[PDB]
Design a protein around this ligand. Structure first.
Ligand SMILES: *[C@@H]1O[C@H](CO)[C@@H](O[C@@H]2O[C@H](CO)[C@@H](O)[C@H](O)[C@H]2NC(C)=O)[C@H](O)[C@H]1NC(C)=O
Ligand SMILES: CC(=O)N[C@@H]1[C@@H](O)[C@H](O)[C@@H](CO)O[C@H]1O
Ligand SMILES: *[C@@H]1O[C@H](CO)[C@@H](O)[C@H](O)[C@H]1NC(C)=O
Ligand SMILES: *[C@@H]1O[C@H](CO)[C@@H](O)[C@H](O)[C@H]1NC(C)=O
Lengths: 236, 212, 272
């Protein structure tokens, strides 16, 4: 059984450096190339670099050259990847992966003429590294006014925008929980600044816009901020 | 130096799906060093196809690979509920390149179009010298959507922040996209639009600094 | 006094084309030892092998070493033509740290070390026809690994088999897995074999593993070229009689310098 056990999850601040380990087992460590590829939250895979555990030779990607360094420790069959000058755009899951091509058979003195890339047959479980410069900030709440134009019978959509908070989670209720039908609170988005933002919208009958009061109750326990904002039809 | 895949593919249980993977030259159309990988949410990839058409020991024969000219293809026959995952192709075109990733859905409910609600920036936010357009997308299946913003009729790419799709309680998907502007940009243009594309069909909503 | 009893201590470079071997034997220059790559496609009338010659590539041995050395020496040439052998499904250009060339792992320039591709080694059956007017000499090998672990990691089969045939001959070799004393820190070995193909004939090679494949053929010629072991320096003179102790004049009908002679020489007599 070939195994690639990676180090634990990392939470770093921008500008610092992170170093991830990858302990191999179940095969000759120095006989195969070892790749490092990352995957940003919600994006695809991006190959970073590979290393020859036999000789120590490396091959970094032009985008990562100058900022990432690969190394190995043959005694414990562990490889390391260090990223310097971390960005918020460096937040991803980092994987070490073993290459498919066998390149050395030591006792018979064989070395493959050239390396050909056929794939990565064994991957590590992945190391999650979060790079955030944000501290503990309460949210800003703005009203999302319902549409002034209304149909006879139809519905309106009003909500409140919970802007720039850290960290998760935040709870949103409408009229102190008395309004649950039609409530749709969307999962938050993580901005480049490291802060979160979400929106919560409730659909209500248009006839009720001018009589019923609608208030969204925002609660952010990490900062102990509570906001009761009233959402009313636009001025015109 | 890139490989292109369809963003989304879908099929019903028992059918067959094909995921293409196109390049340029000196890769998928010279060397067949093409490998395919299956990835479950929160899990490490698994090699399912190497050398273009070869299958590692233990991968079901329902998976198969075939080339053409500069395209590669992964076919999944006898589609099952457990086949739902993201599929990536990879090869070598000067360096190790990966495809964008294809989300394959095994259709268990009728395809639904997304509902799009776009809110203009509130008068409260504009007085804080900030402006955010909120584009809320819900009730679409399968859960793959591309969002494009427009200033009048010109594309906007800066200031956009879009979530990955999330599951609702009805087992359909929801997503949101935010466009950040200055109050001047909002008041200088005649209108802004949020364009939502799902399974080839586009839904568009428009807001302006003038309408009420 | 009609017996030639002395020589000049030097081999004259005329009128016969002399090819000094320096640190290389004829077989090492034939295979393509990195130190002997200067001898590629060279011709000679007399190849001079020195006692200081040594191998510096992968440790090998030649069953019937004398006959291959004699056959190539009596051809007087190392002209080599590359042929497009189609080994589909395997890894080529195998190298070794015991065969250094330009400070990098390398191998015999005339041989092609074939191994498995992703732990698969399909049965190679390749056919190479000789549509020429001369005879082709093919040099190939069989690799003998140390263990069964290396046997599998090199060829993905517990045992290979090699069969090189024509419409006239057949050569079938089984590798011998086992340890041997470490030559340049290598306990494996390679056995060298050769095959001659005539005009109109076809070279047939079947291998399931362990094949050290050829990259082409050597042209075979007929003539009075030969090989001689001597540590005598090569000099700027002219003499039609060469002995390992140097060139001798052919005035006398007899000579006692040495029995091994090349060219129009006097007969040998014992004495001293
Ligand atoms: C090496 O393998 C080849 C291909 O399998 C053999 O060629 C075949 O030989 C058989 C009889 O031995 C014929 O019936 C086939 O027609 C041949 N195939 C072709 C078209 O090449 C070859 O005989 C094998 N060599 C040896 C000596 O075993
Ligand atoms: C024959 C061969 O491939 N030799 C290579 C050479 O091309 C390369 O410049 C060097 C890098 O140090 O590694 C060795
Ligand atoms: C492999 O061998 C081929 C043909 O002899 C040659 O063209 C190529 O340079 C070799 N590759 C290496 C770097 O070994
Ligand atoms: C075959 O290739 C080798 C490369 O070392 C060269 O020495 C030889 O002359 C070539 N022969 C022909 C006919 O090109």
């Amino acid at each position: 059984e070939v195994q690639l056990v990676q180090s634990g999850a990392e939470v770093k601040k921008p500008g610092a450096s992170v170093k991830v380990s990858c302990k191999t087992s179940g095969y000759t460590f120095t006989a195969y190339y070892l790749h490092w590829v990352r995957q940003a939250p919600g994006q695809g895979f991006e190959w970073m670099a590979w290393i020859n555990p036999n000789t120590g030779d490396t091959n970094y990607a032009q985008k990562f050259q100058g900022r990432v360094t690969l190394s190995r420790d043959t005694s414990i069959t562990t490889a390391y990847m260090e990223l310097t000058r971390l960005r918020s755009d460096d937040t991803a899951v980092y994987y070490c992966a073993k290459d498919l091509t066998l390149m050395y058979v030591f006792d018979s003195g064989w070395a493959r003429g050239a390396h050909d890339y056929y794939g990565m047959d064994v991957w590590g479980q992945g190391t999650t590294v979060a790079v955030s410069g944000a501290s503990t900030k309460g949210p800003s709440v703005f009203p999302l006014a319902p549409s002034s134009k209304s149909t006879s019978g139809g519905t309106a959509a009003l909500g409140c925008l919970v802007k720039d908070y850290f960290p998760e989670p935040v709870t949103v209720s409408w009229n102190s929980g008395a309004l649950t039908s039609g409530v749709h609170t969307f999962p938050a988005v993580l901005q480049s600044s490291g802060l979160y933002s979400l929106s919560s919208v409730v659909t209500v009958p248009s006839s009720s816009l001018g009589t019923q009061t609608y208030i969204c109750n925002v609660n952010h326990k990490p900062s102990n901020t509570k906001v009761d904002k009233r959402v009313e039809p636009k001025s015109c | 130096s890139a490989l292109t895949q369809p963003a989304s593919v879908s099929g019903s249980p028992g059918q067959s799906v094909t995921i293409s993977c196109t390049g340029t030259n000196s890769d998928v159309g010279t060397f067949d060093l093409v490998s395919w990988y299956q990835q479950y949410p929160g899990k490490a990839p698994k090699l399912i196809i190497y050398e273009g058409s070869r299958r590692p020991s233990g991968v079901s024969d329902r998976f198969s690979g075939s080339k053409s000219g500069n395209t590669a293809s992964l076919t999944i026959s006898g589609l099952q509920a457990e086949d739902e995952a993201d599929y990536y192709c990879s090869s070598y075109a000067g360096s190790v390149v990966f495809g964008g990733g294809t989300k394959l859905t095994v259709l268990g409910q009728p395809k639904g179009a997304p509902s799009v609600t776009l809110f203009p920036p509130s008068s409260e936010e504009l007085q804080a010298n900030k402006a955010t357009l909120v584009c809320l997308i819900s009730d679409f299946y399968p859960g793959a959507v591309t969002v494009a913003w427009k200033a009048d009729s010109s594309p906007v790419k800066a200031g956009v922040e879009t979530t990955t799709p999330s599951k609702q309680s009805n087992n359909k998907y929801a997503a949101s996209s935010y466009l950040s502007l200055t109050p001047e940009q909002w008041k200088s243009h005649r209108s802004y639009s949020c364009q939502v594309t799902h399974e080839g069909s586009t839904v568009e909503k428009t807001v302006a600094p003038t309408e009420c | 006094e009609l017996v030639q009893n002395s020589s000049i201590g030097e081999i004259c470079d005329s009128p016969h084309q002399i090819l000094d071997g320096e640190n290389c034997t004829l077989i090492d220059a034939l295979l393509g030892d990195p130190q002997c790559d200067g001898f590629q496609n060279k011709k000679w009338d007399l190849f001079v092998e020195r006692s200081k010659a040594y191998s510096n590539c992968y440790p090998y041995d030649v069953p019937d070493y004398a006959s291959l050395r004699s056959l190539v020496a009596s051809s007087g040439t190392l002209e080599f033509n590359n042929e497009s052998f189609n080994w589909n499904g395997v890894t080529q250009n195998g190298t070794s740290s015991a065969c250094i060339r330009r400070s990098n792992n390398s191998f015999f320039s005339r041989l092609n070390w074939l191994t498995h591709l992703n732990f698969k080694y399909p049965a190679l059956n390749v056919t190479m026809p000789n549509n020429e007017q001369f005879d082709k000499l093919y040099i190939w090998g069989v690799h003998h690994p140390v263990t069964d672990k290396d046997q599998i990691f090199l060829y993905a089969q517990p045992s290979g088999r090699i069969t090189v045939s024509t419409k006239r001959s057949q050569q079938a070799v089984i590798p011998n897995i086992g340890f041997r004393p470490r030559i340049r820190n290598i306990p494996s070995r390679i056995s060298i074999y050769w095959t001659i193909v005539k005009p109109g004939d076809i070279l047939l090679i079947n291998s399931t593993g362990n094949l050290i494949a050829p990259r082409g053929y050597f042209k075979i010629r007929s003539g009075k070229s030969s090989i001689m072991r001597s540590d005598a320096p090569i000099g700027k003179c002219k003499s039609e009689c060469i002995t390992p102790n140097g060139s001798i004049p052919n005035d006398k009908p007899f000579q006692n310098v040495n029995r091994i002679t090349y060219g129009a020489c006097p007969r040998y007599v014992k004495q001293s």
